[PDB]
Amino acid sequence: GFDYDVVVVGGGFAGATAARECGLQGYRTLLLEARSRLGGRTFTSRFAGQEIELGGTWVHWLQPHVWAEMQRYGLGVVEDPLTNLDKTLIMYNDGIVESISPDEFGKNIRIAFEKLCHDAWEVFPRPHEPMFTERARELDKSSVLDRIKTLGLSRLQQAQINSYMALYAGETTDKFGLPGVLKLFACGGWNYDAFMDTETHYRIQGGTIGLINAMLTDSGAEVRMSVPVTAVEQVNGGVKIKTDDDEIITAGVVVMTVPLNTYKHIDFTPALSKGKQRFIKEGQLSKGAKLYVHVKQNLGRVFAFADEQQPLNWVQTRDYSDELGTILSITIARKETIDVNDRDAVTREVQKMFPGVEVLGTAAYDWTADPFSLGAWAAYGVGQLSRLKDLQAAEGRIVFAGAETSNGWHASIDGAVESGLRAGREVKQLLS
Amino acid sequence: GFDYDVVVVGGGFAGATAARECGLQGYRTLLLEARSRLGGRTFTSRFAGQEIELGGTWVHWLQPHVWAEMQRYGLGVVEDPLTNLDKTLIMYNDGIVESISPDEFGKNIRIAFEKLCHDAWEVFPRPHEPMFTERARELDKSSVLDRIKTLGLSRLQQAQINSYMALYAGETTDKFGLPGVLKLFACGGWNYDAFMDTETHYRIQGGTIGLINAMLTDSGAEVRMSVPVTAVEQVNGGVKIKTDDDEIITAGVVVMTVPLNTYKHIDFTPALSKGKQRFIKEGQLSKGAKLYVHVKQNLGRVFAFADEQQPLNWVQTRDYSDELGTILSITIARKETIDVNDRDAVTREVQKMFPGVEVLGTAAYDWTADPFSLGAWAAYGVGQLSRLKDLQAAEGRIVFAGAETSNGWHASIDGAVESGLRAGREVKQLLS
Ligand SMILES: Cc1cc2c(cc1C)N(C[C@H](O)[C@H](O)[C@H](O)COP(=O)(O)OP(=O)(O)OC[C@H]1O[C@@H](n3cnc4c(N)ncnc43)[C@H](O)[C@@H]1O)c1[nH]c(=O)[nH]c(=O)c1N2
Ligand SMILES: Cc1cc2c(cc1C)N(C[C@H](O)[C@H](O)[C@H](O)COP(=O)(O)OP(=O)(O)OC[C@H]1O[C@@H](n3cnc4c(N)ncnc43)[C@H](O)[C@@H]1O)c1[nH]c(=O)[nH]c(=O)c1N2
Ligand SMILES: CN1CCC[C@H]1c1cccnc1
Ligand SMILES: CN1CCC[C@H]1c1cccnc1
């Protein structure tokens, strides 16, 4: 006799997926979202006359959960200009920007990545069972920098791969866990060309928010925004959920999908297991941010890495023409290197990378400062992947999901969807 | 005012998927299946104390649609013994059986396959859009043998790759379309090690029939077996469906999922488009069959190719031990090379490959003789992939699906599931 069969906390991809799974079974379903918008660590917006994605953006058909959703809802891919590049740049830690022949640039990051992931087949034959091999557990004592130091890379190759890895860490690479990277590489078919294609090439037709809305419309669930959950109590065979204004909603089961780094906002009664408490105290690593810049010049199709002591770590073209100029998509590994909301600073750093351009505008999102993400994409520190099952475990009538808790594409939209399908299955089990 | 909102014809993976999609929307749904069982070109059975799969068997997490279903229903993988092989054999067209070091055997098929598919990245950058490039249309004038003749392969390599390709054709390789193979290779991450892992390594926990049953239970649809549809007439804004005993069922929309090679059993009014009629007159190529053999000896973990003039084209171990002996899974490219239901012949051919073994039993399935498949897995002849859209097109209130009609993994369970998700979306569009 509860208010709802299931309450889903969080309206990103994990929560939207879980609510869709539950609603299609006929369960009375409520989704509670803290922000005044949906999408979570994805956010569709507009800038310089284009639709832009200020969080998670790119997907691929090798990513099984999100691709199946795109198949169900009839969403095509939209290709960003990553082939036939006009310029490929590396900006080293010492501030030098060097233009590299695009063919040579791609050959060298491929060599570095395949060397970094040389044992991916042996360590992760089953990337959706991350601790399947003893070697993966042994490697979880090492960081990505530990391995980079043994590869004998050239100066170009070392700068490229350390830029790539600092971005995926949202942190310096001495803190970044090694097995999680090998596992993503295995997910992308154990080969660099395939894996790179999955990461920044194709966007969703209609945007991330379009797929969120399709799922929630399908679900039939009641959806409420601007309602943060601040406490969850298991009592009377179900759960009592309290919001910041002390209203109480009861439910048979709760699906938690909030980002790991935000669990400090929520009091659990009884306390969560010690393993989960350890993960909550640690958090995940990433301190990233994202921004678009509109410049007056037509730079064509460009790509740049910047190493971890520099701010503009991953740059590529979103749009270009003589009439428009260029819109650049820029992802930042560590928000401490640049205040993406400080336009003067942004203009200085962009000109450092592209001397002589005039900045006509910017659009930025500081995911690390946002109270309802407190960080960016999921990134495991040393030793954390080994303990993933602690985060995944159900605790009585509370089910846990979110990209951090997925087995496969944990840094991606796909991993969020995966965790939501798992959550739907677990809700069905708990309501049987 | 029809009997049903939607009638799904056929209870293989495409039909089970479509019925699930439609039932979860609340549409009044009926599935009609011709055989007295479900599963279509998959069939879970029992032999020598083990559960066996006499049709489609192996899946992979790089296959997005079937993997997402396994995530939803909580189905793990079951690994067959393909690593650390004890014996790898090649049987040439001239009947010689040669034992090859397993490491060398794998190196040589990898070289042959990567050479055959050397241009897969350029021809199929988007494997789910098969005619995206002009080069793919140009290559659809050539057969797989046409390309093999230009590779300069060794005797071992040519025999290995021609065996592999005759199996995927279910026919001799001079008739097999080239682009469809390049496209499957692209689906498997554009690399041989990944692609091979997707094809014969992992089975579905609980079997193909377990996943069919889960989908149809979820669907809530009414399911009727031993009811072949023999005619479909579009009339009165919907469809009239006639069965072999002249009963008539009416519906708003019909989803056709029967195998292409069986369309001769069904009269359409009005006639289907000329493009579809051409495909129906041509059919798809494969003439394959499958069988398991129980021998008294423990052969360990074995793998064999046999070239296309010989019958046992793809052999691997299903189970082995000293107490049990060995169960071998054998797939046959062309049913004209061996009568899989003739036990004496099977014993002769197995002994030709494994001289000295004692055959204790067999279990076989002649998919090419079965009236409700009239062939095996989908295999395109020369020029057919270019015309795929003709087969996919809706015709008024009739939607078409089945693995032959998919864009990606068309030779697989995954492509069937893909086509069923597409059909569900199209039914939703037609009922709006
Ligand atoms: C800048 C940037 C860039 C990328 C990416 C992320 C970021 C930040 N990613 C990763 C991808 O965006 C990410 O993995 C998923 O969006 C995570 O979805 P979840 O639903 O797990 O969490 P997510 O954080 O999206 O959703 C959780 C929800 O919980 C809410 N919430 C928090 N506390 C709450 C409370 N107390 N009460 C109620 N609700 C609460 C939040 O407001 C949020 O809506 C990505 N991926 C990819 O596939 N391709 C890409 O290109 C990128 N790039
Ligand atoms: C021997 C063998 C081996 C393999 C495979 C196939 C075969 C035959 N495949 C391919 C895979 O099995 C195949 O692609 C799908 O099962 C096809 O699913 P569909 O639903 O498209 O057709 P499918 O043929 O399964 O379903 C069509 C249904 O329509 C019914 N029907 C026909 N005419 C009718 C009528 N007039 N009225 C009513 N119903 C009618 C049939 O009885 C059948 O149940 C495979 N794939 C893979 O992923 N891994 C693998 O290892 C293999 N290996
Ligand atoms: C594809 N991604 C997953 C998480 C980070 C992200 C990414 C990669 C390159 C540039 N920006 C974001
Ligand atoms: C994995 N497959 C798809 C269709 C044919 C099939 C196959 C491959 C190897 C041996 N038997 C069947």
Side-chain angles (χ1 to χ4, degrees), chain A residues 55 58 164 167-168 198-200 290 314 316 329-331 377-378 411-412:
Chain A
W58 297 285
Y164 206 130
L167 198 282
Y168 275 69
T198 68
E199 293 309 283
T200 72
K290 184 159 178 191
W314 185 301
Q316 63 184 53
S329 175
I330 304 187
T331 313
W377 48 87
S412 315

Side-chain angles (χ1 to χ4, degrees), chain A residues 20-21 24-25 60-65 67-75 77-79 121 124-129 132 186-191 193-194 197 202 218 407 418 421-422 424-425 428, chain B residues 20-21 24-25 60-65 67-75 77-79 121 124-129 132 186-191 193-194 197 202 218 407 418 421-422 424-425 428:
Chain A
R20 202 266 324 272
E21 298 293 283
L24 290 188
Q25 292 304 308
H60 200 269
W61 47 87
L62 293 173
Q63 297 172 332
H65 310 96
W67 189 260
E69 301 298 340
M70 283 171 71
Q71 190 71 239
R72 165 177 290 111
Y73 294 112
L75 314 177
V77 297
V78 177
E79 187 185 346
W121 257 112
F124 289 101
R126 298 194 191 186
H128 294 276
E129 300 176 52
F132 184 73
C187 285
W190 303 273
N191 88 82
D193 289 332
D197 205 47
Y202 297 102
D218 216 7
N407 283 319
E418 176 201 324
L421 298 174
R422 174 184 78 225
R425 165 161 37 90
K428 301 170 221 131
Chain B
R20 198 268 322 272
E21 298 295 282
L24 291 187
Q25 294 304 310
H60 200 268
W61 47 88
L62 293 175
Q63 298 173 333
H65 311 97
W67 191 259
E69 299 301 343
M70 298 168 66
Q71 191 69 235
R72 167 178 288 111
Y73 294 115
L75 314 179
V77 297
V78 178
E79 191 188 341
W121 256 110
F124 289 103
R126 296 194 194 187
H128 293 275
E129 302 178 48
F132 184 69
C187 284
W190 301 276
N191 89 262
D193 294 323
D197 202 50
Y202 298 102
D218 218 8
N407 280 323
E418 177 202 321
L421 298 176
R422 178 187 73 226
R425 161 159 45 84
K428 295 177 221 117

